[PDB]
Amino acid sequence: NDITDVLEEFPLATSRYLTLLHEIDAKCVHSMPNLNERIDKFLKKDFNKDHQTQVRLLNNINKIYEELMPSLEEKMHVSSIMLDNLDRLTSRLELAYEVAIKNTPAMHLHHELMEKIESKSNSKSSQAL
Amino acid sequence: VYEATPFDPITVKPSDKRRVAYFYDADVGNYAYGAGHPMKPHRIRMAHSLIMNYGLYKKMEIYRAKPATKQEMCQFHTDEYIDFLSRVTPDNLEMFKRESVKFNVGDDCPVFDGLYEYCSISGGGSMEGAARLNRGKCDVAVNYAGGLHHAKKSEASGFCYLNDIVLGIIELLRYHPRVLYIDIDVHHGDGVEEAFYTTDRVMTCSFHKYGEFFPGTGELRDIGVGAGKNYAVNVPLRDGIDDATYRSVFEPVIKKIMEWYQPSAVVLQCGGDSLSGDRLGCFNLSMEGHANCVNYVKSFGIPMMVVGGGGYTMRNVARTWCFETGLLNNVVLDKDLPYNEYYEYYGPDYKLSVRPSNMFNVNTPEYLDKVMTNIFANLENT
Amino acid sequence: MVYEATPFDPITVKPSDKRRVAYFYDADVGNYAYGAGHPMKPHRIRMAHSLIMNYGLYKKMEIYRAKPATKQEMCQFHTDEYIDFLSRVTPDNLEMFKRESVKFNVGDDCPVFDGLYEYCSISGGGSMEGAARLNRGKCDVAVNYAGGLHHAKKSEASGFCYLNDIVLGIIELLRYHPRVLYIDIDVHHGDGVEEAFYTTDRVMTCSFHKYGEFFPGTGELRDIGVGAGKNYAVNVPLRDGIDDATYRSVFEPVIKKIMEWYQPSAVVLQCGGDSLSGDRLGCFNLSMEGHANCVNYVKSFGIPMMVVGGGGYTMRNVARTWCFETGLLNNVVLDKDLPYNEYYEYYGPDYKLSVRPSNMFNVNTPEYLDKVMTNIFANLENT
Amino acid sequence: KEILTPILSLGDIINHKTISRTFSSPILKNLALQIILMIEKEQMSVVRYSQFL
Ligand SMILES: [Zn+2]
Numbered sequence: 001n002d003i004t005d006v007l008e009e010f011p012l013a014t015s016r017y018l019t020l021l022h023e024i025d026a027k028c029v030h031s032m033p034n035l036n037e038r039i040d041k042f043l044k045k046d047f048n049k050d051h052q053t054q055v056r057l058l059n060n061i062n063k064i065y066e067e068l069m070p071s072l073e074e075k076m077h078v079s080s081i082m083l084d085n086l087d088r089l090t091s092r093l094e095l096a097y098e099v100a101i102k103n104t105p106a107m108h109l110h111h112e113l114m115e116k117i118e119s120k121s122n123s124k125s126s127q128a129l
Numbered sequence: 130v131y132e133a134t135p136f137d138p139i140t141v142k143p144s145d146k147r148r149v150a151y152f153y154d155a156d157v158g159n160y161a162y163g164a165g166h167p168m169k170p171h172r173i174r175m176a177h178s179l180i181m182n183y184g185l186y187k188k189m190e191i192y193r194a195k196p197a198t199k200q201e202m203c204q205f206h207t208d209e210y211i212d213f214l215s216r217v218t219p220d221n222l223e224m225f226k227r228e229s230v231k232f233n234v235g236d237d238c239p240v241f242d243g244l245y246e247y248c249s250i251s252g253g254g255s256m257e258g259a260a261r262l263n264r265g266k267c268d269v270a271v272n273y274a275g276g277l278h279h280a281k282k283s284e285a286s287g288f289c290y291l292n293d294i295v296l297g298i299i300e301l302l303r304y305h306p307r308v309l310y311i312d313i314d315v316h317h318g319d320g321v322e323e324a325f326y327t328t329d330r331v332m333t334c335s336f337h338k339y340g341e342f343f344p345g346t347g348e349l350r351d352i353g354v355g356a357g358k359n360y361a362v363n364v365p366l367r368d369g370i371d372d373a374t375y376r377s378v379f380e381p382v383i384k385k386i387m388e389w390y391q392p393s394a395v396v397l398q399c400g401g402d403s404l405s406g407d408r409l410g411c412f413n414l415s416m417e418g419h420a421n422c423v424n425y426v427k428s429f430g431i432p433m434m435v436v437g438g439g440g441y442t443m444r445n446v447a448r449t450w451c452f453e454t455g456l457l458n459n460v461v462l463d464k465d466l467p468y469n470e471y472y473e474y475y476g477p478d479y480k481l482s483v484r485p486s487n488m489f490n491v492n493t494p495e496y497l498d499k500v501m502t503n504i505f506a507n508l509e510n511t
Numbered sequence: 512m513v514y515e516a517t518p519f520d521p522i523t524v525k526p527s528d529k530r531r532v533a534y535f536y537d538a539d540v541g542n543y544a545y546g547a548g549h550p551m552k553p554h555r556i557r558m559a560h561s562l563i564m565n566y567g568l569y570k571k572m573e574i575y576r577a578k579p580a581t582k583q584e585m586c587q588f589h590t591d592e593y594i595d596f597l598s599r600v601t602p603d604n605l606e607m608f609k610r611e612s613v614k615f616n617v618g619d620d621c622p623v624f625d626g627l628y629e630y631c632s633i634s635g636g637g638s639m640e641g642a643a644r645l646n647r648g649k650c651d652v653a654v655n656y657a658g659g660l661h662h663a664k665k666s667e668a669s670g671f672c673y674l675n676d677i678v679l680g681i682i683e684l685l686r687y688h689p690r691v692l693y694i695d696i697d698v699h700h701g702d703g704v705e706e707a708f709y710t711t712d713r714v715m716t717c718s719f720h721k722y723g724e725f726f727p728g729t730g731e732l733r734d735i736g737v738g739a740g741k742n743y744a745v746n747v748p749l750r751d752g753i754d755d756a757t758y759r760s761v762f763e764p765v766i767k768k769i770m771e772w773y774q775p776s777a778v779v780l781q782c783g784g785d786s787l788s789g790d791r792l793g794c795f796n797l798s799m800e801g802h803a804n805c806v807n808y809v810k811s812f813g814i815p816m817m818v819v820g821g822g823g824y825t826m827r828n829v830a831r832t833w834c835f836e837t838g839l840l841n842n843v844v845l846d847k848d849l850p851y852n853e854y855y856e857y858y859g860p861d862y863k864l865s866v867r868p869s870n871m872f873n874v875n876t877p878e879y880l881d882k883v884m885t886n887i888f889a890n891l892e893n894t
Numbered sequence: 895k896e897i898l899t900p901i902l903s904l905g906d907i908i909n910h911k912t913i914s915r916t917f918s919s920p921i922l923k924n925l926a927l928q929i930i931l932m933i934e935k936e937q938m939s940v941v942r943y944s945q946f947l
């Protein structure tokens with residue numbers, strides 16, 4: 001039964017973290033095409049004909065990269081949180097699978113009695129009203 | 130003159146693709162109004178999450194507006210009221226009960242954590258949107274964190290503490306000759322309308338349910354006063370208006386006034402409580418009908434700012450705000466909800482579209498014809 | 512009607528486009544013999560490589576050597592017992608391995624020869640290193656002519672193929688790609704890769720084979736997949752003596768539709784040499800230029816592609832088409848002269864870079880082609 | 895009362911309209927596709943900086 005619970009839990013945390021990642025992608029998505037264009041223009045064979053042009057293109061690339069590190073480090077942070085939370089969730093999931101498969105115990109039997117009381121209390125909450 | 134026009138599916142206008150600056154802050158969604166309160170800033174976070182998970186960030190430049198200061202708020206409000214607002218806390222209200230009864234805070238304007246921070250961030254969002262729209266750096270400012278129009282010069286009512294709309298209007302008026310204001314909220318923009326009665330610079334049009342409703346003001350005879358005569362139009366309606374009826378009662382008025390008034394800048398409130406299944410609303414609009422107004426206003430190629438107010442059922446206001454944000458970029462939406470944090474809150478079908486209710490419409494065509502007759506008659510004077 | 516015969520246009524390549532290709536060759540690949548009377552002959556890789564050396568193609572292409580695949584890497588597909596027996600078996604001790612050989616379907620039609628593990632590891636390493644270099648983005652094309660043996664099952668070595676390195680290459684491509692399109696040209700149906708990837712969506716195991724009385728006995732129009740892999744098994748069964756023009760008219764629409772709908776990120780293009788005229792068992796009549804037009808069309812898109820070898824029961828024609836395809840991969844057309852090499856005396860009495868079609872009964876009626884194209888389009892629109 | 899836990903006789907298929915909703919949910923596949931698309935988008939840039947290094 002815990003397998004069902006962890007299956008419910010997976011998408012919620014995954015989606016929260018993915019929304020965070022989408023926000024980080026959003027705040028820096030307008031510089032990736034500029035960086036790629038600068039790199040491609042730098043790697044052109046007909047570019048080295050003016051030293052000042054090389055200097056200014058290198059300066060532009062350096063400025064873009066200086067602006068781009070913060071997004072990358074925030075991405076590492078959120079991905080690390082992703083990894084640890086998902087590790088915990090998978091741990092719960094595969095303990096649940098191993099327990100459910102090892103025997104095709106009185107403690108988990110008691111939890112049924114504890115929940116049976118709640119089901120009995122909620123069923124009688126409509127009769128008594 | 131009112132004529133029946135059946136509603137048609139919305140298609141974007143590829144003539145213009147103006148820049149969109151969607152102002153947003155991540156701390157607005159933390160504030161809460163109470164336990165049983167209907168007004169929730171959490172809907173702004175819902176809409177932002179829907180936008181983020183939908184793939185709309187590649188087109189629009191997302192910002193984070195700096196909170197406004199007290200001196201900026203004093204451009205329209207009184208020093209005493211803003212001082213009380215800053216000083217009041219959810220703990221020392223007993224010592225501030227005199228101002229609370231005097232400034233009408235506590236009944237529909239509950240004091241909560243970071244209330245002054247909420248007002249400051251909304252005012253700053255509107256201020257920065259107006260600043261961007263004034264410097265030519267942008268043409269559309271989606272300040273979804275604002276939309277607070279019920280607040281007055283020295284009073285706070287209708288969950289509305291700081292009137293950011295009039296502050297943004299003043300910023301536009303810094304260098305613009307004439308500005309125009311639109312409303313779509315079911316209630317009436319009492320504060321924004323009142324702020325510019327005697328002057329020609331600002332016009333305040335509101336499509337507000339009239340009669341025994343919350344604002345209780347804004348009849349057809351609210352022509353103006355002094356030199357601001359005929360420069361504040363009102364379109365009172367009744368319960369149960371639909372998409373086609375709203376379009377037919379909305380578009381001709383705007384066309385006529387911008388023919389006559391000739392605005393140099395535009396602001397558009399986008400109240401989300403005028404939809405089907407709303408908690409505090411009495412309309413039957415859908416997301417297509419809601420987005421029709423913003424698409425129509427944008428189609429005229431004028432500098433416009435979209436603010437966000439109202440909305441008391443999460444799914445409806447979130448979907449409507451997402452649709453409006455998408456259509457402001459001249460992009461039709463997928464109309465399928467991607468999985469996110471709040472996927473469980475989006476109905477039992479998990480579809481972006483929300484079906485409008487079947488409830489009986491009340492607006493008779495002849496009443497609407499007479500209403501727009503008076504509107505056009507008073508607008509023809511100038 | 513979907514099929515439409517068109518005249519065969521001349522070969523044209525974009526001069527503006529630049530493509531990086533990393534040819535893979537292990538000099539020890541062509542030194543294992545299946546037997547005295549066995550159609551399989553690994554010598555073709557060596558002869559083709561000699562041809563590419565002599566034609567001067569080395570000045571415009573990159574070539575390396577792929578490290579042999581480890582046993583654990585090779586076990587990414589096949590069972591542990593299968594690989595264990597394949598390593599432990601020798602042509603001299605099968606008396607104690609008779610039961611294992613009977614179980615594993617080896618010895619009678621696929622016999623045990625010394626160096627079998629070395630050959631299998633060489634092919635697997637070539638495929639895996641090609642896929643790894645494809646993922647790293649350094650080379651757009653990773654040519655591995657040594658492998659391509661797609662008839663190996665998970666626990667059985669049928670059709671003279673003991674190890675299926677195509678599966679491992681697709682796996683190592685899938686480690687960094689969501690969807691990779693696999694194209695088959697071998698006359699026999701690609702039973703191994705098809706069975707491996709029959710219940711998955713992340714691959715597009717497109718095929719162009721022949722249906723009749725054969726050893727595979729698979730590749731029907733009905734088989735489209737199970738589970739999430741439904742309608743993701745494109746098969747185009749054909750018949751005797753399909754010529755160049757109709758083969759091109761069948762290939763180009765289908766591949767265009769796949770690239771327009773499936774939209775893969777990498778292509779694992781099989782280039783089996785047994786789909787040519789004069790083959791030992793292949794019934795087709797495709798010429799070398801027809802065999803290379805498919806590769807040129809696949810290359811014209813501009814996406815990373817992993818070209819592999821495979822079947823081919825003849826040597827001269829297979830080597831000629833392989834070197835022609837390698838040249839075409841560089842946007843360079845190879846002249847018809849076959850410059851002198853150590854194995855020059857092999858190349859027939861014509862001594863020209865060309866394989867010429869024979870006169871065979873073209874059973875491939877246009878009605879069959881129209882029907883199969885309609886079925887393929889119907890099952891492909893669901894993607 | 896549909897909250898009642900499944901019994902050990904494998905009533906998984908004939909379940910209370912809720913277990914089937916999760917076991918039939920294809921959301922995991924969509925999550926995998928989104929993750930791998932992000933992986934490709936990042937790997938293109940990774941190759942770019944590898945060349946520039
Ligand atoms: Zn309202």
Ligand SMILES: [Zn+2]
Nearest residue numbers: 697699785822
């Ligand atoms: Zn073959």
